[PDB]
A paper describes a structure:
The Fe-protein mediates ATP-dependent electron transfer (ET) through its [4Fe:4S] cluster to the intermediate [8Fe:7S] P-cluster in the MoFe-protein; the electrons are subsequently shuttled to a [7Fe:1Mo:9S:1C]-R-homocitrate metallocluster, the FeMo-cofactor, within the active site of the MoFe-protein.
MoFe-protein was separated from alkaline acetylene reduction reactions, run either with ATP (MoFeAlkaline-inactivated) or without ATP (MoFeAlkaline), by size exclusion chromatography at pH 7.8 (S.E.C.). By cryoEM, the control MoFeAlkaline cryoEM structure at 2.14 Å resolution incubated at pH 9.5 closely resembled MoFeAs-isolated. We developed a method for the quantification of HCA extracted from MoFe-protein samples using ion chromatography coupled with mass spectrometry (IC-MS), revealing that while all MoFeAlkaline samples analyzed contained approximately the expected 2 moles HCA per mole MoFe-protein, no HCA was detected in the MoFeAlkaline-inactivated samples.
Numbering used by the authors:
A (entry chain B), B (entry chain D): 2 to 523
C (entry chain A): 4 to 480, 493
D (entry chain C): 4 to 480
Amino acid sequence: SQQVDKIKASYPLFLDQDYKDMLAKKRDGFEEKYPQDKIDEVFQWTTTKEYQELNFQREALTVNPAKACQPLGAVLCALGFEKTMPYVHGSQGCVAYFRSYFNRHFREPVSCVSDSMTEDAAVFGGQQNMKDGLQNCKATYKPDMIAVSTTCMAEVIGDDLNAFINNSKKEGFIPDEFPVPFAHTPSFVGSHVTGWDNMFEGIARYFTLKSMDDKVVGSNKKINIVPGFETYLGNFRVIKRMLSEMGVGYSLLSDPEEVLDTPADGQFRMYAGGTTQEEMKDAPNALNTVLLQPWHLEKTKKFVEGTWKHEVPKLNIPMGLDWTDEFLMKVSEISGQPIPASLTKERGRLVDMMTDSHTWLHGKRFALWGDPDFVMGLVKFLLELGCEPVHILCHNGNKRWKKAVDAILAASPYGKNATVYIGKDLWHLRSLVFTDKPDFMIGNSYGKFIQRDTLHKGKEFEVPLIRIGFPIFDRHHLHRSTTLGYEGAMQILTTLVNSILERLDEETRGMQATDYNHDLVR
Amino acid sequence: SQQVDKIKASYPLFLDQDYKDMLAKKRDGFEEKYPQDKIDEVFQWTTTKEYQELNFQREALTVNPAKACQPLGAVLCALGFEKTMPYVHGSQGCVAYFRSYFNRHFREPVSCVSDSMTEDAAVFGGQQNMKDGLQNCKATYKPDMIAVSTTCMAEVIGDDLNAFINNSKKEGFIPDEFPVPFAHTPSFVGSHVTGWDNMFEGIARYFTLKSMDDKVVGSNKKINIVPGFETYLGNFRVIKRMLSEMGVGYSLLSDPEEVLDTPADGQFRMYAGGTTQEEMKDAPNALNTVLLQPWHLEKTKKFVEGTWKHEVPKLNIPMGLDWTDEFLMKVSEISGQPIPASLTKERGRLVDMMTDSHTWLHGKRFALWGDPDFVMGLVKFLLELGCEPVHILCHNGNKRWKKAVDAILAASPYGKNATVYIGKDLWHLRSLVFTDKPDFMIGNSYGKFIQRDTLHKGKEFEVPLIRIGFPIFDRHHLHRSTTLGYEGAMQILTTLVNSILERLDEETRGMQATDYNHDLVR
Amino acid sequence: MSREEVESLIQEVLEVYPEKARKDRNKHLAVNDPAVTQSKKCIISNKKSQPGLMTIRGCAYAGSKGVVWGPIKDMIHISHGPVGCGQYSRAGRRNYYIGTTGVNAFVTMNFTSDFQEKDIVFGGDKKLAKLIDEVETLFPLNKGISVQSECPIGLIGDDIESVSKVKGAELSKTIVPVRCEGFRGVSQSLGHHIANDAVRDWVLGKRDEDTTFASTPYDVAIIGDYNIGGDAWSSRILLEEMGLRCVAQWSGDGSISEIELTPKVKLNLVHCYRSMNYISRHMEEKYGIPWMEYNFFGPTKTIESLRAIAAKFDESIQKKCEEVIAKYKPEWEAVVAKYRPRLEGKRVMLYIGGLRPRHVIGAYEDLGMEVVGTGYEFAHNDDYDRTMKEMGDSTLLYDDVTGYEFEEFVKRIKPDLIGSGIKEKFIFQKMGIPFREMHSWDYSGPYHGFDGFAIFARDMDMTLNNPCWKKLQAPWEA
Amino acid sequence: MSREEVESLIQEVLEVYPEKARKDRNKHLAVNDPAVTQSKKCIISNKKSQPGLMTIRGCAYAGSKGVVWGPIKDMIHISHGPVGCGQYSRAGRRNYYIGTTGVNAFVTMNFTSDFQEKDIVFGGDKKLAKLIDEVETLFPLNKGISVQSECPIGLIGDDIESVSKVKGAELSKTIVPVRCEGFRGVSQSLGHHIANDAVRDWVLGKRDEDTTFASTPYDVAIIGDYNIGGDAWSSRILLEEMGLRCVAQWSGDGSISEIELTPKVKLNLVHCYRSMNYISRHMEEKYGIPWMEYNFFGPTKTIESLRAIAAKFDESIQKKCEEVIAKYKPEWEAVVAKYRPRLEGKRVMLYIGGLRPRHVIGAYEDLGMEVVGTGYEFAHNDDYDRTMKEMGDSTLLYDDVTGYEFEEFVKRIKPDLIGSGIKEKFIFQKMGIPFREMHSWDYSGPYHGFDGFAIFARDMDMTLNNPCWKKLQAPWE
Ligand code: ICS
Ligand code: CLF
Ligand code: CLF
Ligand SMILES: [Fe+3]
C-alpha cells in the first residue's frame, strides 16, 4: 500500500509488514535457504585468518576484480582528440558496456562505435565489417578522425587492423587521406590502462612515424604532456592551469576534458575540444615529453624516446607535495621558466593545511587500491601526511611497480606496517580489512560492498570507504575533483581529514554514552 | 590502563569497564541524578508539539542563538584592508573571544587589539586608554591604518570615538595624517553583520566624505564590490575571477582573502593583501557600487547613494542560477562588457549538474539558518533545485527581509510548505525539526547538537546536518569553499546530493535487512 | 504529425546513410497502423546491426549472464574469459534480492576466470576446473554454479560442457555451462534463448522424479520478472493477496530451488515474453503447464491482468481478485487525481530493449500521457505484432535505432519526455528534454502493481515538471 | 642561552615599545633564578594589560562563566547581557561531563538574555525574572540557575541579586548572581575569585545543618580540576583505586549536589591553586577541612602526589597507594621507553593561563624534554613563587606576554615545540615550529594521571616529529 502524500520507493516500501511477511513466506516455502545460524557461522568464518589463507591461495578464481579491459582505456584515450570517434573493431556488446561504464562514471554522453562482428566474422574475419563500419561512421557521425581499437574476439581471430584499414582506403570506403590510427588492445593482456597506452602509441605513431625527417627537437618551445588514463577532469584542468601560470608552452595530448564536460544549453555536442591533429603532428618538435602516469605509459615512452628522440624525464605522478615539487622543478628546467610566486603560495597553503590537520591525520591506517600511478601517488601523499597505508592493492600492478612502491615505503617510518599486493582482487582486500583492520578504505565504488561486509561483523569492525579513484558510481560529480598537484593534494587532504572527523562525530553522537567527546571544535 | 601500542584518547578510553564503574559510582553516590526514566520522559516531552508551543512563547530567554555581536563583524571588515589593525575600544575579553572565534573557523592567525578598558574607565571613560592604545599599537605592530570599533562597555558608558581619536592626534600620541577610521558597534543592536556594515561605512566615510569635490562618477571605469560579512574565501576568489573573465575593472573593498590564507613558509605575516587606501579614496570615481549582501549593507548603501552618488543596483546575493545570472547581466550593463563564453559554459555545466542530480534532489525537505543574505540565497537555490526549504530560520533577520523571502517562496511551488522565522534561536529550530521533521539541516556547527538530539529520539528521527555557513568548527578547511556564483552553486549542489546519497547508503547498509537497495549505481 | 509527415521525416533522416546502410535501415523504421496484425508487412526486426552506426544493443552474454542467470541469488555465476565483461556488468542491473552477499547470495559479486594470454593460447579448461574447486572451497553455501562464456571461449575451442559434467559429478553440484559468447546472435535476445536452453537442459528437470513437494490448485510461477527495484515483489504481493501461491520467481530474487519446483505449478505467469517464452513453451509441451502473458504496468493493465489470471481458477480466486481490486482502487485513484493533471497531454518517446516499450504504454496512458514514438533494441516480430495494437495511429516505430536516428527523430517530434537507457539519458538531457531511465527506473521504483504505479507517477511528474528544464537558455543568449 | 644573553634579548625586544609601555613591560619579563623564593623581586604579575599590545588575557566573565560555573552540568548558566559573550564561549572549553544535554545537563548550551537597546536603556531585571520563569518552564530538571553578568550589567545599574533572591524564594530554587562583568579586574583571575565568592555565598552552605550524608574517613574532594578532555576522570580513577572516596569534583563533570556535599569531606585536593585557592581557604577556615595541592602531570609528579595524599591517611591507604603505583609502573615505563628517545633533548616554550605553565614541566621532563621559557596570562606572584623552583636556571619567564614579545622570544630562542592557546597556534605553525594547544589539549587528552601520560607523550611525539615540519621551504627557494 502507498500513501499518496508520502510515496515510498523500494526502500523503505519493502520494510512494510505485509512485504516482510510475503518475503518470509517465500523464503520459508520455496527458497530452501540455509538456516540463519549456518549463514552467520559461514560469514564469521569468512572474516577469519584461516579464510584469508585459503583466499590468498587462489590461482584460477578472481572475485570482484579492481581492473577493466584494454579497449575501455583505448576508448578513453581516443575521446581525447578533436572530433575523433572511438571505433572498436569487434563485437558490439563490448562497446555497449564501455559506453555504460563511462556514462555512469562521468554522467555525460560517451560516443563510441562498433562494427558489430558476429558469428559470420568468427571464421572469415571482420574485413567487410571494418569497411562498412568505417564508411558508415564517417558518413553518419562525421568525425575528423576514427581511432580503432579491438575487442577480444578480433584479437583471438587475428584480424589485421593495418591491412583491413588499408583495404578500406584502397576500395574507396574511406578517403586515403582520412586519419584512421589503430591499436591492438587485447583484453587478456594488461588492463584498461594498457589499452590507453596502446591507443595513444598507435595515434602518435600514425601521425609522426613517417614524417620525422623535418622534425627538430625543441623547435616549437613547447612541452608535450601525456596524462594517461585519467578520469578526473580536474586533473587535466590543474595541469593546464599550472603550466599556464609558469608561462610554459605545452601541448596536452589526448585532452578529453571538454568532451566529458559539455554544457547543458539545449544542444547535444558529440565532439568538443580535444587534441588537434596539428598538435600531434607537431609533437616531435617539442622540447620534451612529460608522462604524467609513467607506469602505464611504457610503450608510449619507448616510442617517444626512440622516434621523437625526446629525453623523457624520470618523473613520478605529480601527486602530493614532493612529487608536485619535482614535477614543477623539472618543467622549469626543461622550459627555462622560473616557478612563479603564485605556485609557491599555493604550495605554502597546502603545507599550512597539512600543519592544521596533522593531529587528526597522524597514525591513521589505510587500505587503498586503484591504478598503479594513482595508488603510488596516494601512498606517497599519505606518507607525507603521517598516515599509514597498511594495505596497498593494485590488481593491474607488476613486480617492478611493487618494487618501486616498496622503496617508497622503506624511505618513510610510516610505511613500516605497509604491504603491497599485486594481482589481488577486492575479495583479498576484504579478507585483509577483516584480519588486519584499517581505519579507512580509499578506493572506487566497489569498496562500498566491503564496507557493508565489515558493518555486518559489527559497528566497531566497520571500515568506512573514502571514494577516490575510478569508477565512482554511487556519488554525483566526484569526477570533477582534482588529485594532481597542490590543488589535488588539498582536495584529498580535506576529504581525508573530514572523513575522519565525520566518523568521529558518528562514533560520539550517543547521548549520555559517548557524547562527552562530541566536541564543537575539532 | 593504556596499551602503549594502541593508546586511547578520551574516546574510547572512558568506555573501559573500570571507568564506566567509577562513573556509575560517582553518579549513584554524589550526583543526586534524576532517575533515567524521568530523564527519558522529559526528553520525550521536549520532542513534542506542546513543548514547541511553550518554546515559541519565549519572550525573554534565548537558547543557543544563531548570531554574534557587532564588533566581530567590525573586526572581520577591518581585516579586509591593507596593513590594517582592528582595534576594539573597550574590554579585552571581547577581543580574546573574537580572535578565538575567527581562529577556530579559519584556522589562521587573527590579529586584533584592545585598549584594555577596566573599572577605572567605567566612570571617567577610556580616553587615556584610547591614546595609549593607539600609540602602542602603531609603535609595536606598525599598521598603515587602525580601524576602531567598540565593545558594549564603551557604548554603554558613551565614549566619543571621534573626540577620543581627535584628542589622540592633537596630543601627539599618533600622527595627524595617520588614518584612524572608527565606527560605533553596539553589541545590543543588530548582530555581527551590522558591525561589518557599521565598520565599512565608517572606513568609507573616513576616506571619502571630505574629498567629494573632485570626484566624478564613472571616471575610473571600475565597479566597486562590497562583499559584506563573508567567511568563505572562495566567495571573494570567485567574485574576483568572474569579474576578471568579463574584463571588468573592479575594486573589491574590504578583501580579507589574502590575510586569511597566508602560506606556511617559515615566516608569520601579520598583514597580507587587502583593500588599499588609494582604492578606498578612488572609490567614488567608480561607475557604480555593487553590494553583494544588501540585507546587511543598508547603512553602506545609504552612504554610497547619498555621498558617492552611485546608483546602487537592486541585486540579490549572487547565489544560485537566477541570481548569478542577474548579477552578471547587471555587471555587463554597468561596465558595458559582454558576458564571455567561459561564463556561459560554466552556467551550462551547472545546469547539466542540476539535470543530473534532480531526481535525488527533488522533494527533499530542509531546515536551514544563517545570515539573511546567505539564507535567502540558499532558499532561492533550493527552490531552483526542486527542494523544499520547510524551515527557514534567521535569528538576525527583520520583517522586511522576511517579507522578501516570503515573496520568493510564493513564486515557487516548492515553497508551499516553507515557514520563515525571525528572532528565533536554535532551540526553536530543534523543536521545529522534532515536530515537523525535515530530511536534512543546513547550517553551522551548532546544528550538530540538534542532530545529536534527533538521534536520541531514534535513527528514523535523526536529521543529519549539512555544514554550510559560519562558523564551522568541527570540520577542517571548509572555509575554503565557495557559495557564490556558478562555482558556489555547483559546490552546494554536490554537497547536497552527496549528503543525500551518503544518508541513503547508511540507511541501506544492513545486510539481508535493507541492503537490497544498496545500489552500486545512483 | 500525420502519416505522410512521419514518412517524410524517416526519409530525410535516412538521407545521410550510405546506400547499403540506408537500404537496411529503411526496413527498421515504420509508421504504426493499429489495424495491422502482421508487423512484418511494415517493420523488420531481429537482424544484424549495421557496422559503425552506434547501436544501443548489447551481446548474448549480457542477455544470458546479465539478464537471466545473474539474478539467481544462491548460485555463483562465472564470467568465463577476460575481466572486462564481468567487470562492466557487475551490479549494473538492479535485479533485487534478499540474502547475505558473499555467504549465501552472490548477485552483486563478479566471479571471473580473468583470462590471460596463456589461457587464450593453451585453453582454459584446467583453469576452469581449478576455479570451480576454489569456488567450492571459498563459498561452501553456494547451491550451484553457472559458467557464462565470453567471446574467446567459443573461439579458442574450450570445452566447458565436459568440465561442467566432470566437476558436477565429482562435487555432486549443479554446474550449468552457458555458451553465451558475445559474438553469437545479434543482440541480447539470443542470450535469452541460450540461457533458457541452459535452464532447460541442466536445472529444470532436476526434480522430475521427485514428488515430495505438496502442490495446491493455486500454484503459479512468475516467469520473466527480474525484480528491477523490487518489481517482482510488488507483483507477488498482489498475486498472493488474490489467493494464489507464487512457487517461483524467474529470475529476480530467484533461487535455484524454486526454478526446480516450477514444473510443479498449475499456471505460468509470463511478464517478459521476449526473454522467457522459450522456457514457457517448453514447460507447456513437457509438463502441460499453461502459460499466460500479463501486464502489471499501471492500474488499468494491472486490473485487467488480475482479472484474466483469476479467470483461470475457481470462484474463490475471482472473489479474492475483486476484493484486491476494491482495496487498491482508492490508492491508485488518489495517485491519478494528484498526478494526471500535472501530466495530461504530455508526449513520450520510448526506446527500451524487448518488452517495456509496449508494456509501459498503459501506465503512461493512465496518467493522460500519449506515447508518440516507440521502438525496441532486440525485439522479434511477434513483439511488434503485440505492439501494433498498443501504439496510436501514425506513431513512430523504430527497431535497433541508431544514435543519429534517435537524435533526429527526437529533434523533429520534440517529445515532452523520453524513456530510454543510460547511453541516451545525458544526450537528451543536454538537449533540454526530460529523460527517464526505463531500464533501471532511474535507480527508483518499483513500477509494477499499484505500489509501483504510485512511484511511477511521482517519478514522471518530478522529471517532466522539474524547474531545471526551464533554465537551459542563458538570459543573455534569450 | 646564558643569563646575560637572555637579558640582552629582553632589552632588544623592549626597544620597540614607547617609554611608558616599555617601562611597564620590563617588570613582566625575567630570567629565572631557581634559588629565588620571593618572585616579586624579579617579576611582577596580576597587573593591567597595556592598551593596544594584543594581549592574550580574557575577562572576568571568562574566568567565572567559562571556567568555574560553566562546567557544573546540572545547573543552567545565563549569560546576562548581549548575545556575543555567551555565543563565543559556548562549548569552546572541553570541560567534559556525563548527562543528557537539554534535559538534565546544560554545559554545551548557551542561555542568554540577549540584551537589546531597550534592555540597556530601561534595565533588564524584569527581563531576567521573565527569563527565569521561562527557564523553569522549558527545563524543569535543572537543579539550579546561575546568572553570569556581562559588561553592561554593572554599568546600567541592574540589581541581579534582588531578582535572584526573589525568584529563588518564589521557586524554591538556588539562583546564584555572579557579578563577573568583563571590565572588572584585569583578566580571568578576578573572574575566578568572584565565582568562588558566589559559590561560597549561595551554594556551599546549603547543607550546613544537614547530617544525613554518611561520611567516611577517606572522603576527599577534587577542587580545581575541570575535566578537560576527561582529566578529572583520569585523576579520580587513581584516587579511588587508592582507597579514597571522591565525594566532589570542582567543577568538571560537577553537580551542584557534590558542591554542597564538599564541606563533609576529610581532605581537599586542589589541582588548580589559582582558580580555587579562595574556596579552599574558606573551607579550611570554616569547616576545618585541610587542603593540599597535587600534580598529576606525568608519572613522576603523579607518584609524588599520590604518596603525599596517602600520607594524609592511615596505613591501609598507603598500602593501596603502593599497589596502585606498582600496577601502573610498567605502563608509563613502556610509554617512556617508546617516546623519550623520540623526544629527548627537545626544548619547549610554554605560555598558558595560570596553573599549567608550571604544572606540566614534570611531564615534559619525564620525556627528556627541557622547558626553556614559560609564562602566565594571569597568574599572581604566589604562582611565580611556585614556578621558580620548577624552571631551569637562566630560563625565560614572561607575565602577560604580548604577541610581539612572544614572537620575538620564539624567533631568538628557537624552541623545538611551543605550548600555548588557540590565538598563537597558527602564528607559530606558520613559522615552522611545532605547536601544541595546552588549553584544549588540541582536542585530545586527557593528560592527567598515568592514562593521560600515554596520550600526552603520543601527542608530543606526533606533533614534534611530524613530516610536515620538514616541508615549509620550497625546494626551489
Ligand atoms: S582553571 Fe584556569 S587558561 Fe586553572 S582560567 Fe584557563 S582548565 Fe588554563 S592554565 Mo585555559 S588557571 Fe584551568 C586554566 Fe589554568 S581555561 Fe584552563 S587551560 S588550570
Ligand atoms: S561481446 Fe559481450 S561484453 Fe564483449 S567481450 Fe564479448 S561477451 Fe564480453 Fe569483454 S573482456 Fe573487454 S568487454 Fe569485450 S573486449 Fe572482451
Ligand atoms: S569583556 Fe567579557 S567577553 Fe567582552 S562584553 Fe565584557 S563580559 Fe563579554 Fe560580549 S556582547 Fe560582544 S563579546 Fe563584548 S562586545 Fe559585549
Ligand atoms: Fe552530466
